[PDB]
Amino acid sequence: APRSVDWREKGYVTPVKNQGQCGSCWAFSATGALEGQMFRKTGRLISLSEQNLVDCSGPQGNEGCNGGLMDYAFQYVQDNGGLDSEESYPYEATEESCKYNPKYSVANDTGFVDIPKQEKALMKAVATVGPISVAIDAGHESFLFYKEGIYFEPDCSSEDMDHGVLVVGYGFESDNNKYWLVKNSWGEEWGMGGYVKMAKDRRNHCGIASAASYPTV
Amino acid sequence: APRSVDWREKGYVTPVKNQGQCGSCWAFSATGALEGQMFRKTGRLISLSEQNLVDCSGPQGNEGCNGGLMDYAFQYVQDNGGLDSEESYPYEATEESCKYNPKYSVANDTGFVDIPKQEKALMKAVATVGPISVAIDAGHESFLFYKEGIYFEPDCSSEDMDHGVLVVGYGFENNKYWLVKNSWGEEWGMGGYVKMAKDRRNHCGIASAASYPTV
Ligand SMILES: *C(=N)C1(NC(=O)[C@@H]2Cc3ccc(c(Cl)c3)OC/C=C/CCc3ccccc3C(=O)N2)CC1
Ligand SMILES: *C(=N)C1(NC(=O)[C@@H]2Cc3ccc(c(Cl)c3)OC/C=C/CCc3ccccc3C(=O)N2)CC1
């Protein structure tokens, strides 16, 4: 793998979204990774309907605005045979009723892939694949109020993760200088324009390599 | 016909766009009446690609960024299948190479209907269908540096028109007006909109080249 990656600078990443008062992180994480893969494939960046996942992917094991898994989102897309654009199926930020229309579907998959739970396996993947759906331990007062620099929270857990995010690359900066560039779904006024630099290669910090995946496209 | 009409009140109209330093007025006009008809059919408002129509409707007789006519644009969407979204084929404000992809198509038409050269006939169309493609004489100063009110250019042409726009409704304020959507950004007129004088000897030829696409 490369030494320094940023998939934003390749037009692989849509602008930062906001999930608001609803627990749909998983669906922003899924549409992020599906957006980048549809992009490598088709050359067009089209924003995908997080609401389509929030509404319809209940049977494949999701909990609407109370939690979900990214791979379950990928599984819904494959079974459903598609996913509408953000434009046709806008984010209403509550679980509503399934209004999927196949005439607007702008994405597909043939499944997903689970990266081994090593930070180097997640490095190589972020490098050859594109942006990657990951889960983190986000429960700390200090994440909720993030600003800049490399995030490192001593009390962070490596096996119990609660939040789904998207890894868009990584790089360095004198001390412990490596990081994951993580796209969050809490809008632009949070973090470094919606992004958090996570500590990379400090014992799997916040469990970023523990539940990492991407859709096959 | 209803005392007053507005299609923005009913979500048939996408926001006022801007053609820039390119002569693509026919295209923005064409996409507007086609956006309003799709909403009629489906229930989803989706923004369409002027740049698709600027590049690829050449075979129908349109002249890229140096002009065109709305009915060749409608003909192009039938003589092609559908048309791509704004997001998949963005607007570059210049004539460039044709880049259409059928995988990203979100509109269709079964043809187009032309309205008889009469203002009364146009009132009925707006009221019974939705946004209507029209063509007007815009060469005049009171249009360029125009802020507010019912427009009236005493020396406006009824035969010779050079600018395609969209009619999104009409109303009363014994006065009448045309609720016309322009493509000169939100910065011009009434948020990109203009009140043309209505039922006043076919002012600026609003009713002269009026069409709308069927679905
Ligand atoms: C997002 N705002 C919220 N969190 C979720 O929806 C989580 C994200 C999450 C946590 C952990 C893992 C992933 Cl891939 C995603 O990794 C393994 C998962 C363990 C249990 C996660 C899980 C399983 C089923 C249903 C929900 C859920 C979960 O907590 N998902 C809502 C706050
Ligand atoms: C928009 N910025 C410009 N105007 C045009 O491109 C026009 C719009 C137009 C004018 C007239 C009519 C329609 Cl439907 C649309 O109706 C009468 C027909 C006129 C024919 C003029 C014409 C012919 C060929 C190519 C373009 C064109 C024209 O001026 N169209 C560019 C300034």
CA distance A163 to A169: 18
A173 in Cβ contact with A148 (< 8 Å): no
CATH of the domain at B28: 3.90.70.10
Cβ-based contacts of B101 with chain A (< 8 Å): 42, 44
Q: Which residues 119-178 of B have a C-beta within 8 angstroms of A?
A: none
Q: What share of chain A is helix, strand, coil (3-state, %, to 5)?
A: 25, 20, 55
3-state secondary structure A41-91: HHCCCCCECHHHHHHHCCCCCCCCCECCCHHHHHHHHHHCCCEEECCCCCC
Cα separations (Å) of A177 from A134, A150, A151, A170, A197?
Answer: 21, 8, 11, 11, 11
**Does B163 qualify as catalytic in the annotation?**
yes
Place of tokens 């295209």: B27
Neighbour tally for A119: CB within 10 Å = 20
CA of A164 to the centre of ligand 1 (A): 7
Which residue type is seen at A95? E
CA separation for the pair B38, B17 (Å, rounded) = 18
Say how many domains are in chain B: 1
Using only C-alpha atoms, what is the Rg of chain B?
16
Q: Are B189 and B182 in contact (CB under 8 A)?
A: yes
Strands B150-151, B193-197: pairing is parallel
Q: Give the burial class of A140: count Cβ atoms within 10 A of its Cβ; 0-12 exposed, 13-18 middle, 19 or more buried.
A: middle
Residue among B72, B161, B166 whose CB has most ligand 2 atoms within 8 A, to mutate: B161
Q: State whether B44 and A106 contact (CB < 8 Å).
A: no
Ligand 2: residue of B159, B163, B183 to mutate (most ligand atoms within 8 A of CB) is: B163
Q: Which domain holds residue B100?
A: 1-215
Active-site residue (options: B56, B163, B202, B203): B163
Dist. CA A196–CA B215, nearest whole Å = 47
Q: Which residues line ligand 1 (CB under 6 A)?
A: A 23, 25-26, 63, 67-70, 135, 161-164, 211
Please give the span between the terminal C-alpha atoms of chain B, in angstroms, as a whole number.
Answer: 23
Amino acid, res. B143: F
- Is A47 part of the contact surface with chain B (CB cutoff 8 Å)? yes
The number of the ligand 2 atom at minimal distance from the alpha carbon of B66 is 31
CA distances from B151 to A139, B21, B138, B147, B200 (A): 59, 24, 11, 10, 11
**Cβ atoms B70, B37 nearer than 8 A:** no
Coil, strand or helix: which one is B50?
Answer: helix
Six-digit token string for A147: 């600003």
CA A205 to chain CA centroid, Å, is 17
Q: Where are the beta strands (DSSP E) in B42-137?
A: 82-84, 105-108, 113-115, 132-136
Q: Nearest Cβ partner of A104 from B44, B101, B103?
A: B44
**Burial class of residue B3 (count of CB atoms within 10 Å of its CB; 0-12, 13-18, 19+):** exposed
Distance from C-alpha of A32 to C-alpha of A61, rounded to nearest angstrom: 19
> Do residues A215 and A170 lie in contact, with contact meaning Cβ atoms separated by under 8 Å?
no
Nearest to B93 by CA among B32, B31, B24: B24
Is A184 a residue of the active site? yes
Cβ atoms of A157 and A137 closer than 8 Å? yes
Host H or E run for residue B124: helix B119-128
Catalytic residue among B22, B25, B56, B156: B25
Q: How far apart are CA B89 and CA A138, in angstroms?
A: 37
